[PDB]
Amino acid sequence: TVAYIAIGSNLASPLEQVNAALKALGDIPESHILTVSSFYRTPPLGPQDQPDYLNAAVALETSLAPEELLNHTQRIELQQGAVRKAERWGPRTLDLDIMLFGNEVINTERLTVPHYDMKNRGFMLWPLFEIAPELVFPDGEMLRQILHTRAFDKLNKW
């Protein structure tokens, strides 16, 4: 099964951080990376000196159950972020979100697939379109049409 995962990070030197994350994703059991997007850059809000977010999308082939994949992405966030040395909501973070899972539609308290807000997040859709231009969502929406009709903030490569 092909799952699409979004990586975002504003920690220390984000290049190294996401590379670390990519590594962790490949080391997930019964899983290997198919494709990774270019790295993109989302600036923070306000004029304040604050680090940019690095964004990417990954295509993961897995034979794990979706909840099982979430166990692992949750684990990697904790092992690799700052939640222990700081806060959950930390000024800086490592985010791994399961955007899509096969053509599956999952509606539960701990897991909602497709990711609830991804169609409104250009830092998720543009990297995804780079690696899967022909993608169709379970409800029939075509990724290419959403990008022609919805308004997204400019998004340059890192």
Q: What is the binding site for Cl ion (CB under 5 A)?
A: 114, 137-139
> HSE of 115 in the Cβ direction (CA atoms, 13 Å)?
19
Amino acid at 5: I
Q: Which is nearer to Cl ion, 72 or 115 (CB)?
A: 115
Q: Which is nearer to Cl ion, 14 or 66 (CB)?
A: 66
- Taking the complex as a whole, the smallest distance from the CB of residue 64 to Cl ion amounts, in Å, to 21
Q: Which is nearer to Cl ion, 90 or 102 (CB)?
A: 102
How many whole angstroms separate alpha carbon 66 and alpha carbon 104? 9
Q: Are 9 and 54 in contact (CB under 8 A)?
A: yes
Q: Which is nearer to Cl ion, 8 or 114 (CB)?
A: 114
Could you give the 3-state DSSP secondary structure of residue 116? coil
- Taking the complex as a whole, the smallest distance from the CB of residue 103 to Cl ion amounts, in Å, to 10
Q: Which is nearer to Cl ion, 65 or 105 (CB)?
A: 105
- SS3 per residue for 39-85: CEEECCCCCCCCCCEEEEEEEEEECCCHHHHHHHHHHHHHHHCCCCC
- Taking the complex as a whole, the smallest distance from the CB of residue 44 to Cl ion amounts, in Å, to 29
- Taking the complex as a whole, the smallest distance from the CB of residue 114 to Cl ion amounts, in Å, to 5
- Residue 119, phi then psi, degrees to nearest 5: -75, -10
- Taking the complex as a whole, the smallest distance from the CB of residue 142 to Cl ion amounts, in Å, to 11
Would you report the helix, strand and coil content of the chain in percent, each value rounded to 5? 30, 25, 40
